[PDB]
Nucleic acid binder design. Structure first.
Length: 213
RNA sequence: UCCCCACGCGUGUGGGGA
C-alpha cells in the first residue's frame, strides 16, 4: 500500500485551532474529518503528533494516514497546510534511522486488571524496546547504553470525571517523547509497525512513530 | 488516567476509544 504525511501549521488566531489545541478529543475530530470515509470503512489508522514548540513558532501538527486525506474540509483560516506527501517507506535490513515517538508506556496490572503507566525511565525505555523489537526494529546501542533519550515526560489533559454537578477528578495520560536511533531488522514488519503506530493514545496524539536518517 | 473488545499455566499481551 501507500502512506500519507501532512504538515499542519495551526493559526493561533483561529478559535477552532485553539479549541483543538486545548482538547485532544476536538483535535481528533477535526483531523478525522480529512479521512472520514476511509475511517468509517476501516481502511484508516489516523496518527498524529503535536510538535514541541520552538518558542514564537506556530504550533505544528504532524499527521499520518494510510489513505489520501482531504484538508479542504478544514475551516480557513485554520492552518497553513502544504499539500500532503505520498509516503513509501523504503526499509532495508540494517538500515539505521532516527525516530521520534510520543507514547504512553504501559502495562495491565495482572493484580488489579487495570492499565497503568510505567513509572521509571528504565521501565519506560524497556517498554519502548520491547515494542520496537516485536515490531521489526531494534534500538541502536551506543558505547554506553541504548541510543535513545527521553526528551520529555509530561501529563496530557484528556477529560474530567463526570461528578454530580461538581467538577470531579481530571483524567490524563502520561506522555513520553522518546528520541533516538534504531535499525530495521524485518522491513515488512517494521512497515506494519509504522502503519499501525505504537501503544495507547492514538486518539489523543500519541503512538506516532516517525523515522528518518 | 477512566471505559470497551479480543486473548493468557508468563507478578500479563494486543486492538479501539474518550
Amino acid at each position: 500500500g501507500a502512506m500519507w504525511l501532512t504538515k499542519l501549521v495551526l493559526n493561533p488566531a483561529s478559535r477552532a485551532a485553539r479549541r483543538d489545541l486545548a482538547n485532544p478529543y476536538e483535535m481528533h475530530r477535526t483531523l478525522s474529518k480529512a479521512v472520514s470515509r476511509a475511517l468509517e470503512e476501516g481502511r484508516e489508522r489516523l496518527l498524529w503528533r503535536l510538535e514541541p514548540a520552538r518558542g514564537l513558532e506556530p504550533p505544528v501538527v504532524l499527521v499520518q494516514t494510510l489513505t489520501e486525506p482531504d484538508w479542504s474540509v478544514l475551516d480557513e483560516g485554520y492552518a497553513q497546510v502544504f499539500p500532503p506527501k505520498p509516503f513509501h517507506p523504503a526499509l532495508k535490513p540494517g538500515q539505521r534511522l532516527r525516530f521520534r515517538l510520543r507514547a504512553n508506556p504501559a502495562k495491565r496490572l495482572a493484580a488489579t486488571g487495570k492499565r497503568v503507566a510505567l513509572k521509571t525511565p528504565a521501565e519506560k525505555v524497556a517498554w519502548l524496546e520491547r515494542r520496537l523489537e516485536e515490531g521489526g526494529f531494534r534500538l541502536l546501542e551506543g558505547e554506553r547504553g541504548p541510543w535513545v533519550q527521553i526528551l520529555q515526560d509530561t501529563f496530557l489533559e484528556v477529560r474530567r470525571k463526570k461528578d454530580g454537578e461538581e467538577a470531579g477528578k481530571l483524567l490524563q495520560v502520561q506522555a513520553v517523547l522518546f528520541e533516538g536511533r534504531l535499525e530495521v531488522v524485518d522491513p515488512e514488519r517494521a512497515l506494519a509497525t509504522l502503519r499501525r503506530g505504537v501503544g495507547p493514545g492514538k486518539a489523543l496524539g500519541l503512538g506516532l512513530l516517525s523515522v528518518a536518517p
